[PDB]
Amino acid sequence: TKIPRGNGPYSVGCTDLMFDHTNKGTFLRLYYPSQDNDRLDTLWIPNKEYFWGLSKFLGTHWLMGNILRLLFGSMTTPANWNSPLRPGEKYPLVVFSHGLGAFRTLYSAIGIDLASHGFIVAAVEHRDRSASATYYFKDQSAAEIGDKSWLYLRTLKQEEETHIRNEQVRQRAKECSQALSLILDIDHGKPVKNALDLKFDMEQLKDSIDREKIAVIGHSFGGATVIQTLSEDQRFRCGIALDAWMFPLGDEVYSRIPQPLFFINSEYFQYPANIIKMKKCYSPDKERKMITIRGSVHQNFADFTFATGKIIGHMLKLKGDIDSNVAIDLSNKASLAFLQKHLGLHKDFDQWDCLIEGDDENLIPGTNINTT
Ligand SMILES: *[P@](C)(=O)O[C@@H](C)C(C)(C)C
Numbered sequence: 001t002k003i004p005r006g007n008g009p010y011s012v013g014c015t016d017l018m019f020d021h022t023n024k025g026t027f028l029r030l031y032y033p034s035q036d037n038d039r040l041d042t043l044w045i046p047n048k049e050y051f052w053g054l055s056k057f058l059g060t061h062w063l064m065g066n067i068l069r070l071l072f073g074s075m076t077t078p079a080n081w082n083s084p085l086r087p088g089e090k091y092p093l094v095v096f097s098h099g100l101g102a103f104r105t106l107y108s109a110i111g112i113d114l115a116s117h118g119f120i121v122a123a124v125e126h127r128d129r130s131a132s133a134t135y136y137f138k139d140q141s142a143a144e145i146g147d148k149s150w151l152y153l154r155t156l157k158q159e160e161e162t163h164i165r166n167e168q169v170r171q172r173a174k175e176c177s178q179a180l181s182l183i184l185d186i187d188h189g190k191p192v193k194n195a196l197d198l199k200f201d202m203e204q205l206k207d208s209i210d211r212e213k214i215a216v217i218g219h220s221f222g223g224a225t226v227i228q229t230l231s232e233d234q235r236f237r238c239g240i241a242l243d244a245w246m247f248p249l250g251d252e253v254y255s256r257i258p259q260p261l262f263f264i265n266s267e268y269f270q271y272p273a274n275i276i277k278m279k280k281c282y283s284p285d286k287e288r289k290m291i292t293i294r295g296s297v298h299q300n301f302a303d304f305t306f307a308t309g310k311i312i313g314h315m316l317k318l319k320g321d322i323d324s325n326v327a328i329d330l331s332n333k334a335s336l337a338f339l340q341k342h343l344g345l346h347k348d349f350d351q352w353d354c355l356i357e358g359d360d361e362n363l364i365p366g367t368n369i370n371t372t
Pocket residue numbers: 098099100101102219220221222245298299302
């Protein structure tokens with residue numbers, strides 16, 4: 001795999017958690033510091049239906065689905081599947097929200113890097129019909145059998161966009177808060193039966209969370225999700241919006257976010273109508289920071305930036321002018337610094353404080369879009 005290993009000192013484990021089993025329950029992929037480092041065997045896209053969903057998202061047909069599966073169906077991501085959680089410490093927690101057409105497993109470069117630096121990361125799978133595909137179970141017996149019910153991306157008419165995107169961002173924020181509640185409840189001993197039968201014992205998570213040190217991060221639709229979530233749920237102490245797509249947000253949110261917020265943008269995605277909404281968040285009484293990664297495209301934040309070679313990647317807009325590893329390192333290091341500052345971590349992430357100010361040859365402070 002070309003998805004990069006985490007740069008931090010902790011080995012990384014990965015597992016999935018679904019609870020309850022229904023379409024209203026929480027579904028998430030967990031990346032976490034692992035006790036041991038025995039093999040990097042986590043399957044990147046775990047089910048064929050995700051490839052069918054991606055094909056539908058792309059506006060293609062049945063064969064493209066099968067082509068993607070042939071190419072990527074055995075690809076791994078560098079995490080130890082179901083490895084035991086590293087004991088003896090309480091870890092800060094990030095809840096991560098995916099973009100439109102994505103799903104929980106496609107931001108492993110970010111998740112694994114955060115976990116390698118001592119975070120637990122819960123990457124939610126949304127059931128708002130913004131994921132390419134997702135699944136749930138119709139009853140407990142279906143869960144026991146692995147009899148999945150699949151839900152695919154909803155395509156919208158232009159007349160539907162305003163209303164439905166806002167309904168979806170509200171559902172996404174509810175899902176982020178619900179995922180947090182699930183993890184915090186497990187942390188404090190709530191007996192939970194994972195709807196998925198996996199070797200990872202969820203009891204390991206008891207007394208494993210630093211409950212004061214909680215952040216929400218997300219890409220594109222997931223960046224709007226960060227803002228909606230912060231506005232509704234003060235358990236999240238700061239947020240990081242990776243190339244946020246601001247369209248779904250209602251006017252009311254902009255004055256309702258007390259927590260610090262960090263916008264990390266690509267150079268090549270942003271446009272004035274979007275940036276002006278980010279600027280609406282700024283106020284002298286609040287901490288807002290913004291950087292732009294030079295030579296990056298919207299896909300630099302997601303794992304498909306590592307799926308292909310340089311030429312094919314550039315042609316398909318999965319890669320920018322900048323090296324994908326260099327771009328994700330900047331995004332991850334700047335994020336770590338921001339998290340250390342606003343969660344009060346006692347790590348060495350402040351070494352990257354200059355990156356929050358965009359002080360690097362591959363960063364622009366603020367944005368190239370000077371709409372004011
Ligand atoms: P945003 C438009 O929700 O981001 C998209 C393009 C993905 C990267 C596929 C999630």
